[PDB]
A paper describes a structure:
In yeast, H3K4 is methylated by the evolutionarily conserved COMplex of Proteins ASsociated with Set1 (COMPASS), which contains Sgh1 (Cps15), Sdc1 (Cps25), Swd3 (Cps30), Swd2 (Cps35), Spp1 (Cps40), Swd1 (Cps50), Bre2 (Cps60), as well as Set1. Methylation of nucleosomal H3K4 depends on the prior ubiquitination of histone H2B (H2B-Ub) at Lysine 120 (Lys 123 in yeast), an example of histone modification ‘cross-talk’ in which attachment of one histone mark templates the deposition of another. The ability of COMPASS activity to be fully stimulated on nucleosomes by H2B ubiquitination depends upon the presence of an additional COMPASS subunit, Spp1, as well as the RxxxRR motif in the N-set region of Set1 which is also referred to as the Arginine Rich Motif (ARM). Structural studies of the yeast core subcomplex and the H2B-ubiquitin-sensing subcomplex have shown that COMPASS adopts a Y-shaped, highly intertwined structure with the Set1 catalytic domain at its core.
We determined the cryo-EM structure of the minimal, H2B-ubiquitin-sensing subcomplex of Saccharomyces cerevisiae COMPASS bound to a Xenopus laevis nucleosome core particle ubiquitinated at histone H2B K120 via a non-hydrolyzable dichloroacetone (DCA) linkage. To drive tight association between COMPASS and the nucleosome, we utilized a variant of histone H3 in which K4 was substituted with the non-native amino acid, norleucine (Nle). Methyltransferase activity assays on an H3 peptide fragment (residues 1–21) confirmed that the COMPASS was active. We therefore prepared complexes between COMPASS and H2B-Ub nucleosomes containing the H3K4Nle mutation in the presence of saturating SAM and determined the structure of the complex to 3.37 Å by single particle cryo-EM. In the reconstruction, two COMPASS complexes are bound to opposite faces of the nucleosome in a pseudo-symmetric 2:1 arrangement. The COMPASS complex spans the entire diameter of the nucleosome and is anchored by contacts between DNA and Bre2/Set1 at one end of the complex and Swd1 and Spp1 at the other. Compared to isolated S. cerevisiae COMPASS, nucleosome-bound COMPASS flexes around the central Set1 catalytic domain and moves Swd3, Spp1 and Swd1 toward the nucleosome by ~36 Å. The Set1 active site is oriented away from the nucleosome and contains density for the SAM cofactor and the bound H3 tail. The 88 Å end-to-end distance between the exit point of cis-H3 and H3 in the Set1 active site is too long to be spanned by the intervening unstructured H3 tail residues given that an even greater distance (~100 Å) would be needed for the H3 residues to wrap around the nucleosomal DNA near the dyad axis. This arrangement therefore indicates that COMPASS methylates the nucleosome in an asymmetric manner by recognizing ubiquitin on one face of the nucleosome and targeting H3K4 on the opposite, trans-H3, face of the nucleosome. In isolated yeast COMPASS, the RxxxRR motif is disordered.
Author numbering:
A (entry chain A): 1 to 8, 38 to 135
B (entry chain G): 66 to 118
C (entry chain B): 22 to 102
D (entry chain N): 992 to 1057, 1067 to 1080
E (entry chain C): 15 to 117
F (entry chain D): 31 to 123
G (entry chain F): 21 to 100
H (entry chain E): 38 to 134
The structure:
DNA sequence: ATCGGATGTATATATCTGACACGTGCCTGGAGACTAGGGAGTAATCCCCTTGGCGGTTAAAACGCGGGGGACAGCGCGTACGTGCGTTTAAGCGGTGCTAGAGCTGTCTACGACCAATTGAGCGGCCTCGGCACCGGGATTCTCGA
DNA sequence: TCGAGAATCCCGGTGCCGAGGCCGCTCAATTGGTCGTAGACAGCTCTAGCACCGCTTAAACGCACGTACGCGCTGTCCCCCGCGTTTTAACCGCCAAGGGGATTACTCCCTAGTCTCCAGGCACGTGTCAGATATATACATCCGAT
């Protein structure tokens, strides 16, 4: 009887680094798009509505959050569609079917 | 949220812990099915057709 | 400010898709995705700018984006909601 | 022995006083593990469910002692 | 001189002002809000009744029935977005068959 | 017996301008009444929230204009705001 | 009381519904699946209908209660 | 003697049903079903006549719509039949599950 | 400066009685604040809509109960209504 | 592809009702006029925070390539689905009866808005130290080729 | 099948900044009291939801046959991934300025609110013609043989 305790070149095959990036991103919680390109994209899109806006620095950021939480979610759905068609790749005809079923195109 | 932040060896509730506490439940998930919790990340999940054999 | 949508580069889309759970991207996704994102951004910033020019000011606040989001079904917690 | 090692200079003794956590046997394949949380600034031993556990199932757990009535499919003859 | 005629409308500006007041929307209803709202509602009901009548005419009838409102709305491209979630009763479906199915 | 008000007669007066010889049935008139109610409630609710945001209490013809710009789709918004401003102009004189 | 009345949604009825929706060759296991789906939808709507009735101290489910129950779920209905 | 080719009566029925506006499910068994589902929430329920039909109407515009999506999923898998693993995808994508 | 308000101190007083040693961050505090505001608006809006259909002119402690029982899912509804009625009883008899 | 026919659908005349459209009273919601008051419009101004620019650096993007896993096409087997026919069965329709419960009206009162004086809860500004991010060096696991 | 090497987790040491407590100071929540009215409630009327009965007849069920499509397998080829090298601009820190977002101070005019006056819209009948069948027949589509 004794006291118990709690303590005392290379080339990965294709498809394994992906299954590792999935696990390392599904556990992180940062933003996955560069901040200056998204800044400029938001400013450039808002030209078509009013010429010279000033975009308080918390607005832009806000958008980015949503812009991730949309795309990510979208991809989830598209994934299923791919797996439904008995394949592993996700194709543009998957995104379109997800957006159609989900109501964004009708 | 506190249960999560403790089972993660921290002592400060943080947006990721609220996202976990919500999306891991089953009824708090329907009350907040449309919201997005800023800086909450996503829940770990990998399909079974994708895991190697 | 012309042709900035190319700023949503390929690795960013790869990372978003990894967090989404997909394993083997195609090669054509990286344009369908920019189209989708541009459509979403137009639909949101239109209402944001409406909310911000109804109040007779020239600065898109964060409450304006929060309202423009909540109005389309997608709320957003954390930015003064 | 019901002794348990909190850290290098402190141990828990549940031979005469303790919880029903003294009724969990060592198995070569465990379905529960033991972590060391710190609540209120003090270390405590909690038991987490390693893999899913169905009802009316015995709670296995690895002692790590460093004979064995293991009874597991794959198993070694020593608790040590 | 009713306040609708003074604007050149057919919708009851008085009744819309009453509804806005008694619907618990804001503390003090403005003056030219009911006029604007009645004009908007009239424009929309005209825009939908025009296509409803058109659809009912091509089918060689003189009475508009829910089938014709269904057709008028779903065939349009911006009313189908306004009424994106409604289910007009006795409306039916827009005839369409996927190309893969027909031989 | 029991008095219930509806938008039947106004819908009829508009039908007699867009098609001077057609006639709505009963079910279709009920549907048009429900449609007018729905759109009224949408626009009124959006104008209410839009006044609450800027910390005001008067719901004036600016809030209804902005709510029409928000709710109605691309093209219907333009013609609706045009008809509205035309009617308020022809009313304030 | 009534029991096992879901079987009244026959095979030709589901068949005609699919045909209106555009289907051309229905599988065999579908009928049970759509019976379950229809039962779930009906339960979810009638729950809110009955809540709206109870709140008004009535014993008849009005038509406006069903309309409000449907509207509260983002499925409005014109004609009642 | 004579026999329509297997599957050609399908399109005839498709065109015949997409063109009408009648109610496809029999009215009385549906009344019984809706009347007995509500037995789990109260007991002395009366179900005013125009309510049931209301429900029924909605409860058709759901199923039809759902099938309009199910077909797509079937067509996605290079198929014609709609097997019960299509309804589940079509209900999980739109967030109903 | 103008003083704006929130639910910070009350969320903190609740955290210091559910987990007497944990402490919330700042962004998580703002998230909990916006969550409370959102649920407040949902419940009060449904309660109003419900106190309108019935032509009542007031929004009483029963419109709120039916609103809570409509919006909240299956089991959260029972516990929510129990806590509510307990609080209202403990308040009226005092 | 070509007919021959066989089934189904579309066209047009007859007729038959019941639901839509119109005219009538009549009841109350809408319009006019006037006043008081507070909410919103307008001028001053101040200081926050957004924009713009610049230098370094280094993290991340871009590009090219080799190849192995995956998408896609092509066939056989066989079963389970459609179509047609003869049965059963209960839906639908009409007609009766009746009683529960919605609905509307008058009487009364308990309850919430409104207003005044006040006072302590909480909100803003000041420290400040402990939790957490960062770095480095062990052990510890996992994948892959042999 | 097991070595190896690449990735991952865990244990200490360290600095720093924001989470939390403290102090003054408002201003909004508290208490008390009044007063009008929203609604509770007892009661009566009437309609419409529920249940039953008889016929008939259209829709549902069971069964047979046969064939079209699901599907499992095999086989190309091609393109997306993993990795290494070169290039770019994101990011961080910093400085300067000025627009416009808040806030304050007056003022006035737009709307609630009340009383007076009446006409428009809603329930109620009555009339007829628009559409639903019904029948006969013509034209279109589809399937077998060749
Ligand atoms: C926590 S106690 C287990 C409780 C024990 N079953 C009882 O009845 O009290 C652990 C002790 O039980 C015995 N034990 C537990 N698991 C065992 C095993 N797998 N084989 C042999 N002895 C075991 C040893 O004496 C060990 O020190
Ligand atoms: Zn053993």
């Amino acid at each position: 009887a004794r006291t118990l305790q709690t303590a005392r070149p290379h080339r990965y095959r294709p498809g394994t680094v992906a299954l590792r990036e999935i696990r390392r991103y599904q556990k992180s919680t940062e933003l996955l798009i560069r901040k200056l390109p998204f800044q400029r994209l938001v400013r450039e899109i808002a030209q078509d509505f009013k010429t010279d806006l000033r975009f308080q620095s918390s607005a832009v950021l806000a958008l980015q959050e949503a812009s991730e939480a949309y795309l990510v979610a979208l991809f989830e759905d598209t994934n299923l569609c791919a797996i439904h068609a008995k394949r592993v790749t996700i194709l543009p005809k998957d995104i379109q079917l997800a957006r159609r079923i989900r109501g964004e195109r009708a | 949220a506190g249960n999560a932040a403790r089972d993660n060896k921290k002592t400060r509730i943080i947006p990721r812990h609220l996202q976990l506490a919500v999306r891991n439940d089953e009824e708090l998930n329907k009350l907040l099915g449309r919201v997005t919790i800023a800086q909450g990340g996503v829940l770990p999940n990998i399909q079974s057709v994708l895991l190697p054999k | 400010l012309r042709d900035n949508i190319q700023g949503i580069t390929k690795p960013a889309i790869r990372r978003l898709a990894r967090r989404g759970g997909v394993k083997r991207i195609s090669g054509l996704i990286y344009e369908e995705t920019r189209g989708v994102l541009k459509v979403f951004l137009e639909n949101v910033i239109r209402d944001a700018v409406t909310y911000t020019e109804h109040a007779k000011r020239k600065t898109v606040t964060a409450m304006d984006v929060v309202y423009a989001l909540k109005r389309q079904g997608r709320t957003l917690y954390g930015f003064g909601g | 022995s019901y002794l348990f090692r909190v850290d290098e200079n402190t141990v828990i003794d549940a031979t005469k006083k303790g919880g029903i956590a003294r009724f969990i046997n060592h198995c070569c394949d465990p379905n529960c593990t033991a972590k060391i949380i710190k609540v209120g600034g003090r270390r405590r031993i909690v038991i987490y469910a390693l893999r899913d556990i169905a009802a009316s199932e015995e709670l296995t757990y690895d002692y790590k002692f460093e004979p064995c009535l293991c009874g597991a499919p794959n198993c070694k003859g020593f608790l040590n | 001189k009713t306040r609708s005629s003074r604007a050149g409308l057919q919708f009851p500006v008085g009744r819309v002002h009453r509804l806005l007041r008694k619907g618990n929307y804001a503390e003090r209803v403005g003056a030219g809000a009911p006029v604007y709202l009645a004009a908007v509602l009239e424009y929309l009901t005209a825009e939908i009744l025009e296509l409803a009548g058109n659809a009912a005419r091509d089918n060689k009838k003189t009475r508009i029935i829910p089938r014709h409102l269904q057709l008028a709305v779903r065939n349009d491209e911006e009313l189908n977005k306004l009424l994106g979630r409604v289910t007009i009763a006795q409306g039916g479906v827009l005839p369409n068959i996927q190309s893969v199915l027909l031989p | 017996k029991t008095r219930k008000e509806s938008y039947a007669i106004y819908v009829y007066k508009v039908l007699k301008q867009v098609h001077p010889d057609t006639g709505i049935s009963s079910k279709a008139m009920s549907i048009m009444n429900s449609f007018v109610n729905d759109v009224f409630e949408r626009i009124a609710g959006e104008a209410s929230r839009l006044a609450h945001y800027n910390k005001r209490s008067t719901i004036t013809s600016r809030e209804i204009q902005t709510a029409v710009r928000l709710l109605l789709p691309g093209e219907l918004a333009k013609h609706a705001v045009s008809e509205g401003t035309k009617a308020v102009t022809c009313y304030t004189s």
